[PDB]
Design a protein around this nucleic acid. Structure first.
Length: 96
DNA sequence: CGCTGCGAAAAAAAAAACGCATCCCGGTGCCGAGGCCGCTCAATTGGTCGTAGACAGCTCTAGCACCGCTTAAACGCACGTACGCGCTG
């Protein structure tokens, strides 16, 4: 048929339907959301990595992703992202 | 005479007429979203190994107080000049 290009578009849909259940999203914009995710992936991973290296750690922990997010994101956005991030970690650990 | 009243006359200014552009209404029609079909490869399980990082301390650096001598800046005020600021043609 054709090779398989991955995305984030299905995970954007799910989050869109959670947030505005009566709303669609044009291809062109779904692109722009994809780009966005990808951009803010590379940025948090990047700074995460730099943090690890700078401190001689070979392991990127949640602790790095957290500090990455505190450096990249502005005050309010950071707080929440730190909160939604910590929440997710706790609820994953406790599930096993 | 002065006052005044009026009658312009002069703008103001208003109003209103015109005509133009921006909105919105309601029925077309087209295409891409959104939703199914299979299906395939990437995530999960579970479980083995070995080493990154947590800790418990051991060292000696280097960063924080205190302390007067000695200046070179700071504060500051007064006087005056060059510049910033605004109006017009």
């Amino acid at each position: 048929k054709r090779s398989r290009k991955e995305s984030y578009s299905i995970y954007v849909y799910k989050v869109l339907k959670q947030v505005h259940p009566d709303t669609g999203i044009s291809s062109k914009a779904m692109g722009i959301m994809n780009s966005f995710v990808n951009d803010i992936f590379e940025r948090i991973a990047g700074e995460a990595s730099r943090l690890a290296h700078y401190n001689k750690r070979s392991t990127i922990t949640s602790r790095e992703i957290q500090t990455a997010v505190r450096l990249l994101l502005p005050g309010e956005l950071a707080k929440h992202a730190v909160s939604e991030g910590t929440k997710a970690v706790t609820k994953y650990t406790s599930a096993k």
